[PDB]
Design a protein around this ligand. Sequence first.
Ligand code: FAD
Ligand code: MTE
Ligand code: XAN
Ligand code: MOM
Ligand code: FES
Ligand code: FES
Ligand code: CA
Lengths: 450, 760
Amino acid sequence: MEIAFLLNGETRRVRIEDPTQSLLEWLRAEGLTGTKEGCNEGDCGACTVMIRDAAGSRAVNACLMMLPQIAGKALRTIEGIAAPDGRLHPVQQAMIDHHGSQCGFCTPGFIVSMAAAHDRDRKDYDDLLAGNLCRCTGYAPILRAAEAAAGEPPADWLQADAAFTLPAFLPETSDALADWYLAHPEATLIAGGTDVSLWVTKALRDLPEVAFLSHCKDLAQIRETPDGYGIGAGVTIAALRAFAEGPHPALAGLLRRFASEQVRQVATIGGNIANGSPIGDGPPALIAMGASLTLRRGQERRRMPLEDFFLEYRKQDRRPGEFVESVTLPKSAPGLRCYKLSKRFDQDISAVCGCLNLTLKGSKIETARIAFGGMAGVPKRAAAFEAALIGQDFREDTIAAALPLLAQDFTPLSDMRASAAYRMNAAQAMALRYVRELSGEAVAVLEVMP
Amino acid sequence: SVGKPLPHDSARAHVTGQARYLDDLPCPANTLHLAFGLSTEASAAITGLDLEPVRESPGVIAVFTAADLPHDNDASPAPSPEPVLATGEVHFVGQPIFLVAATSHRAARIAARKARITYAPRPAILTLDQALAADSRFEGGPVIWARGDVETALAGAAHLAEGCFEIGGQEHFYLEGQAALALPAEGGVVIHCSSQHPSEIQHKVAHALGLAFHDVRVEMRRMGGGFGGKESQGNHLAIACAVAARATGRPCKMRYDRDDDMVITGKRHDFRIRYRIGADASGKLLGADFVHLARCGWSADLSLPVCDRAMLHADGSYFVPALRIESHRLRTNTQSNTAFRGFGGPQGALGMERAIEHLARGMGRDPAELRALNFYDPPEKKTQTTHYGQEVADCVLGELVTRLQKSANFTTRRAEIAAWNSTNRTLARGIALSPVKFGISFTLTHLNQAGALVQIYTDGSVALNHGGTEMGQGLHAKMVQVAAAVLGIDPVQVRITATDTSKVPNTSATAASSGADMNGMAVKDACETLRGRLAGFVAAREGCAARDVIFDAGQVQASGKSWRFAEIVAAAYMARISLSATGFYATPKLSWDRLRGQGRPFLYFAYGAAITEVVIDRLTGENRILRTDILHDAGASLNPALDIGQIEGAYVQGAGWLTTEELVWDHCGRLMTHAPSTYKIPAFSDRPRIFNVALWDQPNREETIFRSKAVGEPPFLLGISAFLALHDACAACGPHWPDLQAPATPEAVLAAVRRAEGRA
Ligand SMILES: Cc1cc2nc3c(=O)[nH]c(=O)nc-3n(C[C@H](O)[C@H](O)[C@H](O)COP(=O)(O)OP(=O)(O)OC[C@H]3O[C@@H](n4cnc5c(N)ncnc54)[C@H](O)[C@@H]3O)c2cc1C
Ligand SMILES: Nc1nc2c(c(=O)[nH]1)N[C@H]1C(S)=C(S)[C@@H](COP(=O)(O)O)O[C@H]1N2
Ligand SMILES: O=c1[nH]c(=O)c2nc[nH]c2[nH]1
Ligand code: MOM
Ligand code: FES
Ligand code: FES
Ligand SMILES: [Ca+2]
């Protein structure tokens, strides 16, 4: 099988034979030595590369991405960031001017992230560069660099790549996929690859039967439905954050702290949900907002509520040949709030994910959707706490009284991320939070002004 | 060019991705790749080692065992053996047992995992108590130093704070992982590696191989970070490559994959510190009694000196008329802890800073004032000494802190915070000021030497080479600036060459923030030799005194005539004047007794202060630094840009150590925090939202290179400022002593808040 793509302004035809080779392995085997390896686990950004296509351009991790995924795309690496004639990008000159580097090892990845950001006139640096670890500089010098360079006009040589186009199954239609998965129920479905590629890099597994989903436009659509909003499985977390920014700010507030921008760009809801992981911050929020989920098995179209999908740790209501086709969200909350608790705010995982959503008939607590991640081998609603909260007054003590019930709802784990005591404690802490937030109180460190 | 804010020697190379690291260097297609097979017990004998499935994994060319080691099996930077390959038994989870050479790095890792090992497990020392309990310790007994008589002092103390608390470890997380490459070269070998100590690499690889030192060459251009992590942990890789090259006949590379890196390599010694501290009713300290329990891991490594430096730094910034330290360096079946920026310094320092915070709180005094009351006296009868008895004659701390306090708007802000807290019940702000006094020089004295070699070519260009290794600290540029400044020419004329044991020999590691100090002197020494030659030549040609020949701004001037530096050099070339010079430096005035705890181990101290402001979520423990204000003494800084850089970088790493950074083992000794997803260094938006750094600019009293001061490590201890501020936020949630532990994770902040509120 043979793909084609733009590589640093120049069309390159690779002839695929191992479909699972990271973009990282491949670039450095080519001698494109400037893309560095820092962890091979999505965390550090040292391998940050720039990809473009009809959607535009974004910085992603070369180590998570596997070759087939860049077919028909335009790809820029560090060695291609500067102009053909030799001129430095405003981003590169800035970084020198402002001493944005010291040992250098993380400098290619920032530059790529900074260029791609410059290319899309994005200025939200804290978020754009959260996936870029630097152990040397304290990041300050890098923030100046970014600001410094933002005055400058975008690189046209970079923009030029837009012109472009304009073994392992690669379907383009949902149908095409259904039929195939129907015959090969035992195959591995790669969406964004952000969970899957760690089985190859870290777990050292070989994936025999492989099908890629990121080249299948109809599966990755946000459509409006009579009953709300239909989000397709292939929609990226970045996109889903973008869409929620209007209708569902609270979800967009939570998705902000989902991995980095470089994972968000390629990681999907379908994947997050098909992974089926107790610490996955997608389900908690979506269950709290009472979204439905859709499955498909060729022509099949089962349609349960999300929470019911997750039966036990490592086990979901998923048939052979059946793939997460989409989820549907209601037209609106706004009684939803989401709480991610981690050791460090940006790119970390949740000890506890508290997602709460109550409706109030004037004063009496009417509806109780309280959902959690990280408290149990499955994401689940706080049943007995939910029960013990209906009919009641919406006030501190109301909930102050109900709290213990969670200890019946869950029996949390202890591990490096947090002690069970604390995981419990913080789970209850979120309820006292919810009331306080919902009554005009100062509640969030992140919103505090220096 | 000294004094100018000139950029890093490789700034452009970095920014373009053309700066090569070890895994980037070209090399022959026949190069093999190396992975270790690691122990899965913490304390076992090996009874069965079947490696057949390893030899048979695809691409695998050789499999190696301790029995297969030609000569030495020792990577320890210390006089006690530490095998590179397990010798009949294992001592922590992650210990290399065998070595695989295969035709690719994947293949190698893959096969490393295929061993059938049988163990006969044994009881394992994992907690510091089990260590005291079992007597699992290094040195045979604790190290004990006393100045005066604490017990007496404390007995009569108007005020006393007794306490105990934990300081956790720290993993380097240098962005460039450990790595090496060995090239068989008829009779001998050439090693390229990511190391801070090429000469030790040479030593080790030589012994591994049976070669005299003159057959082993170590070249090293730059590391993508080291922070002490590469002060010795590069040894196992280099030995592995060398031994495997000798056997296979072909070049051999080995880079640790990140997980391997955290499982294998040592980290920063975690401490339990127990303290008793006393003051009279004026607030002057009477005495301080410390006991240090340090986790050294399974082998000595550099634990002995690390712990020595904690003791040395137990005075914090303060004069103390009676002080005692009892230092237990306890052996455990875990990662052999090693150097990390600060080298025991920040641990001892924090122990004391916690004690003085306690005392202050306990007599309900403003902590800042109490510290300020106990700084060593300003420079100017007999000078105050340290507990080890070194005179402190450079202490500018009193004034620096004053200057920092006004420019940070300290008083006002504190009131602003109180008011804010009073109106809040979910969130809360704390603020702390903490000083720094860091002693400069290897406490192992004979390590305080540095060499340089300089060549001038006939086109007037200069090739510069020294023993220092570049790991991001901007050493090379400073070395360039010195040489440019001495020859009286533009930096651009001076090229830096890779560090190379065959160019400058017998070098110390680049550590103890001594690199620029001593290599700076070494470079200037060769440079002056070279200048002396040109002056003496010109003087004799132009009739006059050599001291009257001027080298400046790339021009030379003698007898009212002036030339370009080049024209002069071509002239001395033709006149047959050697345009090559070695240079060497040994730090003066150093003498001390390690055992008796008395002497002058340091040339001078590096000072500073920081004021961190933070906020905490009283429900969850979540938190942010909002503002930081640093004033730090770089001496007459050799490069103010590069210096601000080190300080900003050092602070963030220090603060990181006392906050989100946490090492965690399971009950079988397995490291659970062994990747970036589980071990959490400051992410971007962790930078202090307002970051103000300013250099105390005042020349050094002692004759260091252009009266500068090492800035390598000192600014790391400014991170205490953050931990102290965090505890200040807690102490505003209740009347109780919060007793915050380090690292101050959200969990640990929540716990300390709850104590202060006084609930379970
Ligand atoms: C650095 C880093 C940070 C991360 N941070 C977070 C985080 O903050 N929160 C969080 O929840 N997760 C996080 N993750 C992991 C997370 O699960 C993924 O990043 C993402 O949510 C999954 O998207 P994906 O398309 O890459 O899934 P993939 O990796 O493509 O898929 C994972 C599994 O789902 C299957 N699958 C995918 N799509 C479908 C489908 N449509 N139908 C049926 N099966 C399917 C795949 O075959 C595989 O079995 C992080 C990962 C990394 C590397
Ligand atoms: N960028 C960067 N700066 C760094 C380090 C590093 O690995 N990377 N290591 C430090 C350590 S551990 C020491 S000892 C020093 C000292 O280097 P010098 O002796 O050349 O000052 O600076 C520090 N600054
Ligand atoms: O022997 C040593 N003594 C020291 O003080 C030191 N600092 C870093 N590395 C060191 N080694
Ligand atoms: O002494 Mo610096 O190498 O930690
Ligand atoms: S290597 Fe760290 S993100 Fe790919
Ligand atoms: S400068 Fe060393 S990691 Fe960024
Ligand atoms: Ca290490």
